[PDB]
Amino acid sequence: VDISTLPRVKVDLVKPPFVHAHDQVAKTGPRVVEFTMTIEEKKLVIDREGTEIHAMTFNGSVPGPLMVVHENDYVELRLINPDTNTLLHNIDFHAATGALGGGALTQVNPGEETTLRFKATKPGVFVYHCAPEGMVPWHVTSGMNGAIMVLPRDGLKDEKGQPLTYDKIYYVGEQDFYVPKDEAGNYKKYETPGEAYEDAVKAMRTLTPTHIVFNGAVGALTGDHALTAAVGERVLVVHSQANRDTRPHLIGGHGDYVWATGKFRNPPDLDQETWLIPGGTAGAAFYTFRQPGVYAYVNHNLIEAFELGAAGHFKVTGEWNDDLMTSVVKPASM
Amino acid sequence: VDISTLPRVKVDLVKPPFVHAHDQVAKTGPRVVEFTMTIEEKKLVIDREGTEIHAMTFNGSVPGPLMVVHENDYVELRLINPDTNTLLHNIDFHAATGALGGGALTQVNPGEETTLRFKATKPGVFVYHCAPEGMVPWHVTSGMNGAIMVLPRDGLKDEKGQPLTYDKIYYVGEQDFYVPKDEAGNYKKYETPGEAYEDAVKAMRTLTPTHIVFNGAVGALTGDHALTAAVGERVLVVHSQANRDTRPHLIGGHGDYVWATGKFRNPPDLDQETWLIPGGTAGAAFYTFRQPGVYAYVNHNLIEAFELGAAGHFKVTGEWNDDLMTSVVKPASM
Amino acid sequence: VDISTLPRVKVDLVKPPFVHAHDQVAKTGPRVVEFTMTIEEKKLVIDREGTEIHAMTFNGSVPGPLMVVHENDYVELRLINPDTNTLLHNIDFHAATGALGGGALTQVNPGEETTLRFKATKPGVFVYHCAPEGMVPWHVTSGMNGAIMVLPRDGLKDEKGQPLTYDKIYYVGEQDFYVPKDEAGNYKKYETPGEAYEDAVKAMRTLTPTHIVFNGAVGALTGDHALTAAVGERVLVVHSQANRDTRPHLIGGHGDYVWATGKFRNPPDLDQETWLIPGGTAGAAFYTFRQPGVYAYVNHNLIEAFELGAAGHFKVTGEWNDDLMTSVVKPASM
Ligand SMILES: O=N[O-]
Ligand SMILES: O=N[O-]
Ligand SMILES: O=N[O-]
Ligand SMILES: [Cu+2]
Ligand SMILES: [Cu+2]
Ligand SMILES: [Cu+2]
Ligand SMILES: [Cu+2]
Ligand SMILES: [Cu+2]
Ligand SMILES: [Cu+2]
């Protein structure tokens, strides 16, 4: 069909871990879904010690926001690189077909913009990331990555062909950073991106992240920013990692239905404790909460979780089920 | 149903790689299965060089013993921390729902005990591990982890709905250790756990294990302690890794049926050479032996296997099948 | 059936990434498929800087060539170790059953040869590699590994039982090297293999590759040696990694059907962006090209791809589809 004849709609994005409002069951036929993102280079404090890096972002956040469309919609993105930025950027969608995912068509210097369109032909969650030729891992590992969800037009299904309907959705972007260190082990600081580049390449080549965080910083998804749910609520957690493997795990829960490699035409894996999301992939886990209280949601390399930053919390409200779990004899001397 | 009315039974555990006797087909309805484990902090020699660490164990072994129940049984564990220990401990079951898997309800100082109950609602093999708030990876990577198998009530099945019945079962716990090193590369020794802690955190933060072993030490599953089987015997190998990915492989065999991420409501992967068990997961592989002789069972990062310790042996008895394999021309000059 | 009565055929191998001619649908019943490979120790330049290593090869290439048979054929390999070599070698097939995959039966000193036969009882792609007792990871990580494809007799199938027929096939072998470094970080050179050995073991024990390459060198599958396809062509890419995990990704495409762990009795995963091939495994991805131009095929640890070598190219010929992707507004000031 002629694209000028399709319905169109403009989306307004939200900051992770929240996700812009959408309908699971598509209420139109295929449409052109219009997004705008503004690139922002900015200083970010990433840990409790105060370590500050020069982050490269889509729309001011690490990760960039989650975009949501349906299968066979067209994604039309206006990408803006303001003149207050210093570097060249572009965008590669793993959801898209051709021209290096879009990166060959979207190179923008500071002071430029561009508009890309692609057809979202395959249902799933997918990574998107900046990828300028010759400096690709530097941009990705400076935070310049996010994800897009392409829902089936009829929503998610279980393997029996019955619907799986989530009540809430969160997007957890997991970021490996490589802050350059001196031989004593202290982080270096730099005067310009160009003076940092070789140091950044050397740090990356060690293959050892200095920090691994959710939503851009140690502790970002804790305290006043903990994730929330009620007992009985169905929650979808989309989780991306653009550069290294991760192994997500809900401490005190499970993934009832998990698309570990993120693609909805496949039946989900059931009853997972932990799953493997390869670097360069988005995955998705569906869980119905059964107990109240605090949960930690982690990368289950527990060093990566509890020493390097890859840990957030849920606070869950409701009644405690002693059939599922109880303390028979509380800790006591003996 | 009211829990005080269910059948009960007391289990007596065995040391890995052996597994306490149980029935594949459950002969009772749901029951309360009572276990006791005693925590033991102890010195362990982990390699041929004599490197000695302060291990943290459930029941005196690394890994802790395999517990076996059926789906919808209740697990009731009496956890004892004798006053001859120095640290605080607890337990998190990945099989359980609520209170951080049990860790929030089971904190025991030296001289204390506690009794936890949980309903085993999902069939599979699962990790269990100690997880005291603020020192989680230190306990796990000191050996304080094991696994629990929750069998379907009707036993294991293939994808056609026919039974898979094992003749023998082994439990391989794989442990990554992070022994602190000085700048020359030699292992440090410490006077108290507290004096070691910061050094342990620094070693963990490198993300590079110094040792990766089966059953607690280099060579533990070799020689007089090699695993055994006969030609034609059906063997289930349960394999856990509480903190890092592993890639198991039977040298000279296969995994005929593999639940790589361990959950029995999913159809197994067939005919595997090698499979990925994510850190924080237990998996299970079923194989029928077809040839006698020595096999090595390894993590197929062969450096991890043959230089760092992640290798054991099977000795298999029976007839050699020249149809499956033969030397046509033995090695000779030419 | 008596093996002396079966048909026989002699195969002549080709250099990767090409694959010897074969039929997807087997035109004979089970047969004895005769191969010969000659071991070659040789100097290889692996990067643009000129770093030269002493490689250990099957048939002169890294990886060794792809062998192709059908399920229940017999593989009969004549392995030759000429007297111009210095080391002892053997071969382990992950496709085979017994005697450590063949390694226990195929030990050849320089000046010796041997002939092994095994029945290829399981369909899939599988790793093969040298594995001399006591020096296994040194040989594998010096390049001494390849793969074998065991096709079902009726060819590949989708999950509905309909045929998947590829028009072309490529074999990408991915190699992690561990070139020894001094404390300043410069590569060491050695006078004999024996003088290098301890240094090689120390480098391996860091677990950190210095190089990760396709087809034996940085840039090997680029320029005049880029992979090629036409729009509409069905391509199978077999990808092996004998020692570390990889996460393959076609930049600008997908894996339409992927056997991530390589075994054809399992239904493929659909619509993958990226997939996890565990170390010690071969996998296979089937894709129909839909857009022309340059693609990069990478390990999606982008540091491993673009800094350490794990990147090749496709050049695809044909018409551009503006329905799938177009630049609406080309980059411009604003
Ligand atoms: O049980 N979560 O480490
Ligand atoms: O074939 N096992 O390295
Ligand atoms: O989108 N490939 O990095
Ligand atoms: Cu950028
Ligand atoms: Cu990418
Ligand atoms: Cu403990
Ligand atoms: Cu855990
Ligand atoms: Cu060799
Ligand atoms: Cu092997």
Coordinates of N, CA, C and O and ligand atoms in Angstrom, one line a residue, chain A residues 249 300, chain B residues 92 94 129, ligand 7:
Chain A
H249 N 17.7 -11.7 36.9 CA 17.2 -12.5 37.9 C 16.4 -11.6 38.9 O 16.9 -10.5 39.3
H300 N 22.8 -11.6 37.6 CA 23.3 -12.6 38.6 C 24.7 -13.1 38.4 O 25.1 -14.2 38.9
Chain B
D92 N 19.0 -18.2 50.5 CA 18.1 -17.8 49.4 C 17.9 -19.0 48.5 O 18.9 -19.5 47.9
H94 N 16.3 -20.1 44.9 CA 15.7 -19.6 43.7 C 14.4 -20.4 43.3 O 13.6 -19.9 42.5
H129 N 21.7 -20.3 47.6 CA 22.9 -19.7 48.1 C 22.7 -18.8 49.3 O 21.6 -18.2 49.5
Ligands
CU7 CU 20.5 -15.7 43.7

